[PDB]
Design a protein around this nucleic acid. Structure first.
Ligand code: MG
Ligand code: MG
Ligand code: MG
Ligand code: MG
Ligand code: MG
Ligand code: MG
Ligand code: MG
Ligand code: MG
Ligand code: MG
Ligand code: MG
Ligand code: MG
Ligand code: MG
Ligand code: ZN
Lengths: 59, 143, 172, 206, 36
RNA sequence: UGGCACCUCGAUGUCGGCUCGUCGCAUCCUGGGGCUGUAGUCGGUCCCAAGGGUUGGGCUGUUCGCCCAUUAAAGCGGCACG
RNA sequence: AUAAACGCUGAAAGCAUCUAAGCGUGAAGCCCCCCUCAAGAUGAGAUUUCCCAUUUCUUCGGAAAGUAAGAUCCCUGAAAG
């Protein structure tokens, strides 16, 4: 799961570590099993979560 | 339970052209070995080959930092008593620039039957012109 | 200290297009490919040389580069002269058209010619002069001629430079 | 650089002008024909292809007689290639005669050695025997196979096997006499092979 | 030429240099040639 | 040459020679050089170099050693003192 | 192309310097030249020539059954074993 969330996060100018920091900082509590599920089946929603993580790292 | 596993032939594999002028031998090879493996895709599956095909041109202009052109030695034993042979990195770049790149990348791939199948996916050319125009490959920029 | 204040007195016009400092002159023409990192400012008399950063690498290249622009302009206009001498019985030296025959004492004659831009001549049967507009080529060729029979200490025989303190060792 | 193919006929001796006596080898080299020319633009290397003896049309097969039909000739028995040869000569379908050589020419002889079957170490490799007396039981055996440390025996440990039947080149052989009418070449010395064996005569490479 | 680990000047005219990353001294007296 | 006693006593055969070799370089010969209290022919000492080569007998079980006669030379060591 | 070594030009360090940039020589040694094996080199290469596009079945991947070029079983043998 970790090596698969990493691949999808690098398509949004982010790394896995920066993505995980932003999600926990913002409060999203989705685990690795479901973040990897969205990265493969519903990539549209994975970009929605990556936007929340990116904004939280910028205040 | 419910975790996606890729099937052979389910993922689309693309062709890439990479210009290898001025880049270090190990900086380029590390980047390439991940494209062949398929670690840049969210469809990555450890037991399935989901990577892409790579063409490397201008392999004679690869970079060797420091005194590696004369101090780096490549060894080769023929299993006969006292049959060890050696070459330098700079001498091999002039004569066999293709062998230098395949020796570097092959050590960065898994050492099993599948990793032996990803090596058949790499084409290295010492010049600036390749022969796979029928596959319509794209240009990939290094990160 | 100092590696500046160059001179280009007449008879020469550099046309360095970045590196190719082509220097013309009455004697000939010389070119090379100076590293395109230090400054060159071709003027009516001086080619200004300076370094971007004051580092050990730049201190060496500052002195090296300037010293050999002065080598060209002197050579391309006036030239360089290297003189050689032969000492020993039967050590004849003479020229046949273009080639040099040296009877230094071996069992065969020793043969020498000068490359392009280098002129070799024999005014007397025991001396040789190498002529040319390139200091590197003129000095190199005379070394090979001297390398045939260097001056041995016991009798002083062999090809020697005029200014050369040969350490003469007592033999018996 | 020239070259022909021939058959080893036998050995004899001749007397030179000084009265000296020398051994020679008789080689018959009739029916040499140029078949094919190979160039860089089609193969990447340059060579000339020669056929030595014609054979009955029964022994030939359909693919073979379509290849010699381009040169307008009967199917041949031996076919070999010669490199390092000037391609300006050697027109297709021409006859190669023994007159290409002359007395005093230095040549090389390539052939296949005579056949020796399963042979032991002291004949195949010229090793030494053990004592035949003084209580010994070691006469014609290979020797120690090696030390104990590797837990194995190294490669190139010479052992019994099939001995002969391998290609050999003998260098710098002189030509004593050339007989164009009989298509016979006299070469001073030995050439590898048995009687009726194919011999490849080529000019010296050194 | 003396190949020793203790290269040091022997007279007043000896000079210490470094050629190809090796300490050596050169002098008009050929007996004073040293290389580390 | 020794110190210890870690594997082996439900068995790890121990000297010399023979047959067959292979590796290290701290080089015996041959190859290339610096210094010399190197006139020449010979030498001394140090640096690079492991490609090939490196004898036949007398005494002794002998390795070792001495001797006879040669040779360009008759190297030193590891491989369960192969 | 180099090892030890010998040099040219040349600054750092107005001189000096075989060295930092740039050049030239330089070993029975390295890589070639010489002889042999070698495409299972699964990366299975190349050239010349020969045979051609049959018939029954399958729901499709496909199968069987007579052949072409070619080879073998069987027999006489040695230059081979
Ligand atoms: Mg018996
Ligand atoms: Mg002990
Ligand atoms: Mg105890
Ligand atoms: Mg037991
Ligand atoms: Mg025991
Ligand atoms: Mg037992
Ligand atoms: Mg015991
Ligand atoms: Mg040594
Ligand atoms: Mg000496
Ligand atoms: Mg033992
Ligand atoms: Mg093929
Ligand atoms: Mg018979
Ligand atoms: Zn001194």
């Amino acid at each position: 799961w970790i090596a698969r969330i990493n691949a999808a996060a690098r398509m949004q100018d982010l790394s896995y570590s920066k993505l995980m920091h932003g999600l926990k900082l913002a409060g999203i509590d989705i685990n690795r099993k479901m973040l990897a599920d969205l990265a493969v089946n519903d990539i549209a929603s994975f970009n929605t979560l990556a936007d929340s993580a990116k904004k939280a790292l910028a205040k | 339970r419910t975790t996606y596993m890729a099937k052979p032939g389910e993922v689309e594999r693309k062709w890439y052209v990479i210009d290898a002028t001025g880049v270090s031998l190990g900086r380029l090879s590390s980047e390439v070995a991940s494209i062949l493996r398929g670690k840049n895709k969210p469809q990555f599956t450890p037991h399935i080959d989901t990577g892409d095909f790579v063409i490397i041109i201008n392999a004679g202009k690869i970079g060797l930092t420091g005194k590696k052109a004369t101090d780096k030695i490549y060894y080769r034993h023929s299993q006969y008593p006292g049959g060890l042979k050696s070459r330098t990195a700079g001498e091999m770049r002039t004569n066999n620039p293709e062998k230098l790149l395949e020796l570097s990348i092959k050590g960065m791939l898994p050492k099993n039957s599948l990793g032996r199948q990803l090596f058949k996916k790499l084409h290295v050319y010492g010049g600036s012109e390749h022969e796979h125009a029928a596959q319509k490959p794209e240009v990939y920029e290094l990160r | 200290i100092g590696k500046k204040t160059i001179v280009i007195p007449a008879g020469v016009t550099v046309t360095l297009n970045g590196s190719t400092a082509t220097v013309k002159g009455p004697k000939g023409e010389l070119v090379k490919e100076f590293n395109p990192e230090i400054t060159i400012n071709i003027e009516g008399n001086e080619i200004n040389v300076s370094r971007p950063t004051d580092n050990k690498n730049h201190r060496a290249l500052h002195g090296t580069t300037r010293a050999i622009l002065n080598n060209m302009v002197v050579g391309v206009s006036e030239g360089y002269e290297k003189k050689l001498e032969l000492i020993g019985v039967g050590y004849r030296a003479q020229k046949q058209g273009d080639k040099l025959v040296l009877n230094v004492g071996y069992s065969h004659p020793v043969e020498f010619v000068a490359p392009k831009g280098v002129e070799i001549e024999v005014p007397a049967n025991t001396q040789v002069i190498v002529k040319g507009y390139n200091k590197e080529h003129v000095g190199e060729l005379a070394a090979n001629i001297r390398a045939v029979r260097p001056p041995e200490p016991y009798k002083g025989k062999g090809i020697r430079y005029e200014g050369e303190h040969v350490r003469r060792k007592e033999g018996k | 650089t020239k070259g022909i193919l021939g058959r080893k006929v036998g050995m004899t001796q001749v007397f030179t002008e000084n009265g000296e006596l020398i051994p020679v080898t008789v080689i018959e080299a009739a029916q040499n024909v140029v078949l094919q020319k190979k160039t860089v633009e089609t193969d990447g290397y340059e060579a000339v292809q020669i056929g030595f003896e014609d054979k009955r049309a029964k022994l030939s097969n359909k693919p073979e007689q379509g290849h010699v039909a381009k040169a307008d000739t009967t199917p041949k028995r031996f076919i070999r290639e010669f490199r390092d040869v000037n391609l300006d000569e050697y027109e297709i379908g021409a006859e190669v005669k023994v007159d290409v050589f002359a007395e005093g020419d230095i040549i090389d002889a390539t052939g296949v050695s005579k056949g020796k079957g399963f042979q032991g170490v002291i004949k195949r490799h010229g090793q030494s025997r053990g004592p035949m007396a003084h209580g010994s039981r070691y006469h014609r055996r290979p020797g120690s196979m090696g030390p104990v440390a590797p837990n194995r025996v190294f490669k190139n440990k010479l052992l019994p096997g099939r001995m002969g039947g391998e290609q050999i080149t003998i260098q710098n052989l002189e030509i004593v006499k050339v007989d164009v009418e009989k298509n016979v070449l006299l070469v001073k010395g030995n050439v590898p092979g048995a009687k009726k064996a194919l011999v490849q005569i080529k000019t010296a490479t050194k | 030429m003396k190949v020793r680990p203790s290269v040091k000047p022997m007279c007043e005219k000896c000079k210490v240099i470094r050629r190809k990353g090796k300490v050596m001294v050169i002098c008009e007296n050929p007996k004073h040639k040293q290389k580390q």
